[PDB]
Amino acid sequence: TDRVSVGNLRIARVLYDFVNNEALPGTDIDPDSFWAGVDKVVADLTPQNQALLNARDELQAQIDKWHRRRPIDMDAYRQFLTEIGYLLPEPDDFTITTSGVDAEITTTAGPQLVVPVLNARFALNAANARWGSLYDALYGTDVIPETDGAEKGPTYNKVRGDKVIAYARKFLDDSVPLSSGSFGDATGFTVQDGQLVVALPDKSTGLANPGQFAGYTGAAESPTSVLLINHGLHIEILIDPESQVGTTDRAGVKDVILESAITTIMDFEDSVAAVDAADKVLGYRNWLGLNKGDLAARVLNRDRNYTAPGGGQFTLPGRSLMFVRNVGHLMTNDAIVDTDGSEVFEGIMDALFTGLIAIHGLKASDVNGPLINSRTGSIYIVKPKMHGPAEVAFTCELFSRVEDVLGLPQNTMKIGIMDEERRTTVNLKACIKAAADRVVFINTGFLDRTGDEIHTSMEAGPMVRKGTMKSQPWILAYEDHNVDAGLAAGFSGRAQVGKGMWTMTELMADMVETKIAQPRAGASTAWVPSPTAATLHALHYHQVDVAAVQQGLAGKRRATIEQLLTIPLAKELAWAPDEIREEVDNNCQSILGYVVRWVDQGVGASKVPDIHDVALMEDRATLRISSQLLANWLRHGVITSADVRASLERMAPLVDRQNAGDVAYRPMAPNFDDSIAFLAAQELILSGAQQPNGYTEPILHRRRREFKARAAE
Template sequence: MADRVAAGGLSIAANLYDFIHDEALPGTGIAPDQFWIAFAAILDDLAPKNRALLEKRDALQGKIDAWYREHRGKASDPAADKQFLRDIGYLLREGETFTIGTENVDAEIATIPGPQLVVPVTNARYALNAANARWGSLYDALYGTDAISQDGGAERSGGYNPVRGAKVIAWARNFLNDSAPLNGGNWADVTGLPIAGGALQATTKDGGAAGLRDAGQLAGYRGDPAAPSAVLLKKNGLHVEIVIDREHEIGKTDPAGIADVILESAVTTIVDCEDSVSAVDADDKVIVYRNWLGLMRGDLSAAVTKDGKTFTRRLNGDRRYIAPDGSALTLPARALMLVRTSALLLMSDAVLDKRGDPVPEGLLDDFVTSAIALHDIGPDGRRRNSRTGSIYIVKPK
């Protein structure tokens, strides 16, 4: 590989060095010389351990291969197989009960259940879509998929089909009945969603009013409490936003003016530098790290063309509401992003060690992505991804 730079006793591909020096490190408080000296120290410590682990894996695999060659054609004996794996140290006996005491863990990891996406970091548009997938339209998801049958004139081809739309709305009302039931009312009969005294007081077709069976499910609202533009509910740590717009194509035909139901869904996303991407040299690595940098700084963008129109996609801004007690409520609009780095096996000549050998790619990924994460979690970080100041690294086996 031509054009290399010497730093910290290492030989670094010039384009990777320039990216680290000019783009990744400014704003983190880390000087380039410090970065490479520290990485060289990490390699001195961990690269031999990495090699030892790979040698152990090869030895275990050799023993397993020999075992199954020896027993080829014989009846399966699960108990003997299990004992063999224990004898060679592949399986260990269950240890003592323990407690995980990790601190500064975001709620999306510790307490909130929800879907997790995996997205290749090399595709900026896909990465932005995944990060922005924390909130999505239930109406769109139902209308555009086979979750709603096309029977009875409810086809989804062509323009808007009001028959299909009615099925979508009915499904969504049943969802609200199940997840946030009213006290003595049905969501299908709601004609308005005013907030009074910090509580939802839904008006119904019969002229009555119905609150939430569990008043604590009201998380907030947006706009005038007497006629809010959005009502925010919560269950199991996840939120549902009911969008109210009587001028909207859907809202103007709805008795309550409900134009959409927005679900908080994909609360975490694995931004993948490994399994779903092909990053084999320094040029590829710079693409990987630059997109991760854009996500951590919040300035990643991508041009998108849809229906003949081009627009720029960026990370969504936070969602803002008024809490039932009148205080301001801000919720993250983006999935918490984890980063999956390379495994132990592969070596990368993007950096050569003091002996001139390629370095473990996983260690390079871990070091660079962690440094870049300081734009979010460092002393001057944005705290827009991890609000507790953590980085979450996913390591393949």
């Protein structure tokens, strides 16, 4: 084979070479020591990693049997969950003690981007998306309707531009109010005595609250830009009377720039396809470039310089503070195998390598690269798919052991707890407590959590449709319970409380209209799928004072355990055959749509047309929910495997047409049984009920390396 033997490890050569020649130099960690560290950590933590995975199966096996042996009695259901150790007791009240955390996280509320780390240009754009032009965001999207001669065309539409300008002016009025008059009638800006002064046609005024003036560039008598702050977020008015847009503008204004994506999550998990050592190195290679601060295709933006209202120079971050999202506890990867040939656990590998690489982001020099990520010295790892408090404790112990190998102070590696499995939801307080000195983030989502919901209660009966799930009692309790737990553990001012991703990348008007609900619910952050979306979602943090919302929610217990445990069973004869048919086709094409690009092209995140040609950018969770739903309906006789195959066959050509604009694409229809993508989609459904916690990675990872194998002959 082509591996390097170290202790019990057989490291893939490409990985070994990458760590030694690219990752290690500059960290002052001795190579041989590092690799012995890896051998040690892997040997020491693998058994516990395995025991936890076995605990999941044992619990699920018990719940399965419980449902088979029986209108649910909730007292008995609950007592049973307590008996098997699924429902643990709730700890007393406490406050997290996590320290050395950047201000982006402790204090600032705002958008958070997620991006596939394997895609360097996407990753590049995300990092630079800390600052984004509101004009570009408004003009380029449907937030401004195209109706009244404001349509987009191959050239700039001045009528549309004026609407953009008016929209921005009104934003300024709502966010940084003048003590009298509107920004719409502004004629110019001057800095007079460390104060911003705004010229109107008939007078001059300052800010209703002068403290919102945070700086400027250029001469104080005629600034090239004015920097403003609201709710901890910065607004920059660019002033340039001789630019084209400036010439038409009443105050010479050229653009309004918003501090947008305050933090970004570089993703190694559900948005990327990485099934082997070659894929993993590409991943780690981009993350290195980002932390070194030298990755380019167009560079990483440098920090922005301003003149304080007083008179000195200061510097504001120009990049989005980066987190990394490791894979979770389940999967193994062939990047490392042991002597007998067993693949090493992928999450353990991610903590070591993504942690090692992140050392470079803690300082600027020749050997570490020019740009700094964390200014406080933290490495931020989001850890997905944890089930309960013991799996959290294990993560902390892993990070603790990784810190020792890497020579870092204890608690350097912070953890972001994704709350997307049921056993975490109902034990959330205990999960946070288990990370009380490392936690900087909790969040919620729809697709994975609902996937787990369906899998856990697979045997209980047919579940409601996917669309119906969004409004079920359990999920509403789950959303509120998340925020409550976080606030009760002292998160406001200390850690992020996040909500889920907006997936409809083209429906920006809808996003601006409805996504405001998340800050209003007290989320200090929420996920956006693009830099444009980050900019538009930032408007919400200007309209909503999240700090104040979180304060008003304090001490409230809005979710009962009974609500959390309400299984989304369908009622009697809830559906007409056309409705069943609609739902089946829907899920079949969401699986096909996502799966063809995963297996054939190693893409896990992209604008995928849904059954009604709406463009969604979902991650791999879309497979979990969809497949678990179909498997649930199969198992209870709502549908048949014939219906499923016939649906998949009906939807395959449609997916084929929706990818016409693509060169690399290879149709699935009409030779279905020779498409590895098509067979994967079909396996995901017919084998769905048998997968551990309904996870799709085992089948998906296998099919992708099958496709890659066929490519190699």
